[PDB]
């Protein structure tokens, strides 16, 4: 006999039908797109601009970053209060 054609893995960028009801949601995610680019991205045809945070997303990350994450100077100034109190 001849054996079957050996099982291979196609490296062409793969896009599941967006409007298809049966499609799993983890394949329609905005993340799936970015990973698609990370594997090929020229052949994938993902717009490179999309791989960075938008204006809104950037204002919101900015907000969180300055809110929960102080400045080095500020934290030193914060330590000085405690040490003075202890002494």
């Amino acid at each position: 006999y001849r054996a079957r054609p050996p099982p291979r893995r196609s490296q062409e960028p793969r896009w599941p039908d967006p409007d298809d009801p049966l499609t799993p949601r983890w394949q329609l995610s905005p993340r799936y797109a970015a990973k698609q680019f990370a594997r090929h991205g020229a052949a994938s045809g993902v717009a490179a601009g999309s791989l960075w945070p938008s204006q809104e997303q950037l204002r919101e990350l900015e907000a969180e970053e300055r809110e929960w994450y102080p400045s080095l100077a500020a934290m030193q100034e914060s330590l000085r209060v405690q040490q003075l109190a202890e002494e």
Binding site: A47, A48, G49, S50, W52, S54, Q55
Partner: protein
């Protein structure tokens, strides 16, 4: 309203530094042996003994310690190609004057393995270095 991006191959060599090796490198030759941490390479020829001990893929002598039932202490010599009885003669004869009695042994011809009762690890390394295996 996408941001503008710039493409370049110049800074890519840094990313070459981050790729892990999938194969272990051969140890760089030095002027002096043994090295500071004590690693000593095998000789240029091989000895004429009718057995040979393959050093493990990190290139260390394949002698280990083992504990069964929490009180049983053993030493396993591994990766032996040849007459293993030849090896057991020598190991036993070498260990005997230290122990006062002939040490208990299990020879495995199918595995190519030797088991010795007790911890002789330290003293066996020194021995398989002398013989050059």
């Amino acid at each position: 309203e996408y941001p503008s991006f710039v493409e370049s191959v110049d800074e890519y060599h840094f990313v070459e530094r981050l790729l892990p090796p999938a194969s272990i490198p051969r140890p760089p030759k030095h002027e002096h042996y043994p090295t500071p941490s004590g690693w000593q390479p095998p000789r240029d020829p091989a000895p004429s003994l009718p057995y040979f001990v393959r050093r493990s893929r990190m290139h260390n002598i394949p002698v280990y310690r083992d504990i069964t039932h929490g009180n049983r202490q053993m030493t396993v010599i591994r990766k032996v190609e040849g007459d293993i009885w030849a090896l057991q003669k020598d190991v036993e004869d070498f260990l005997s004057p230290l122990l006062g009695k002939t040490p208990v042994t299990q020879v495995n011809e199918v595995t190519g393995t030797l088991r010795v009762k007790g911890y002789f690890d330290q003293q066996l390394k020194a021995w398989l270095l002398e013989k050059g295996f």
